[model samples]
Target: KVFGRCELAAAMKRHGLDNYRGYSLGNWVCAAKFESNFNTQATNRNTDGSTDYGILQINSRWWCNDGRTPGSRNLCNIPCSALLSSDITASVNCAKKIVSDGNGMNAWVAWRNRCKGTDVQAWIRGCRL
Candidate 1:
């Protein structure tokens, strides 16, 4: 959907991601910023020959299949392109599932590398949540 920071925050709030399932909204915002800069259509190839899709940059290896990839776990049971749409519901739901699977926000390398200990409030600055 290519949301601005404020837009993203509002969406997160609506999704109850302000403190979803024990993770803070800051974590989700920060991860999206670094993962795909809020680009819903974002995709990237990994060194392992797996492709990451959507705003979360979800790995095709375990989350969704592009149909051209091999060994996709398809845990989200959704088409990978669904993650790349402006409607983010599917992606958000899948993301929550990923967190439940034990990686927490560490599921996103961006969150681990950049948002983990930083002042994530900055990501939502000026957003009246």
Candidate 2:
């Protein structure tokens, strides 16, 4: 499912993403914007053959058990296919894990390049949350 901006924000908020790990909902929302454009089923491959999954683009190398990524950490302890579900609970949980990995939002280069220190109010603006 591809989420509209506000829809995605509301979903993320419902899943406890607001101010999670000291990062605002906008931080995650912005990462999703660039990561997969709010696509629940989005999958992208890196040159190293690791895959990024779901809206947050959690990677197979460390976050999921994709069975193809060598030395897969499966840190989130879930299958990579779970990230593709329109139900984002799994993705959100894994992202929380990612945040706790000590990088916070910097885990995403997209977030660093575009969302860092930038105005992000619009990411959650006008949603009836």
Candidate 3:
């Protein structure tokens, strides 16, 4: 999906992540929307990590277990940090890339399991899925 405006806003909230302006959770959600249409279960078909990987679209080069990156994790085989970033908006910014580059969310492949729409917002009266 080509990121427009409203979609990007929703993507940010999905992760509760903050962007450059401080807390841009909403903006991150928007980015996600534009990137993957909020498809929490999204994954790349031909992603090589160095280019793209999961739902939030992270370049494996930066955070992969290829034994190349300093803190790389085995994403293709093992899963880690699919839903979280050592930094807040770091994941959110990754989401932005998929939108701007026409790539599927690769960074989120492992992280998506840890998070869901319902995880984003839960309450006694209502919940999300």
Q: Which number leads on lDDT?
A: 2
**Cα deviation of 65 in candidate 3 (Å)?**
3.0
List the candidate 3 regions with Cα displacement exceeding 4 Å: 1-23, 45-51, 66-129
Question: All models: lDDT?
Answer: 0.85, 0.91, 0.40
TM-score, candidate number 1: 0.94
Listed per candidate, the RMSD to the true structure in angstroms reads 1.1, 0.8, 11.4
Question: Which ten contiguous residues of candidate 2 have the minimum total lDDT?
Answer: 120-129
Q: What's each prediction's TM-score?
A: 0.94, 0.96, 0.36
Question: In TM-score terms, which candidate is top?
Answer: 2
Better-scoring candidate (lDDT), 1 or 3: 1
What does the lDDT come to for candidate 2?
0.91
The superposed Cα distance between candidate 3 and the true structure at residue 89, in angstroms, equals 13
Per-residue lDDT tens digits for candidate 3, residues 1-129, read 343344434444454443433323443453354445554434443334343434455555544343444444543332324423323244455444433443332234433343333333211112121
The per-residue C-alpha lDDT of model 2 at residue 96 equals 92
Clashes of 2: 0
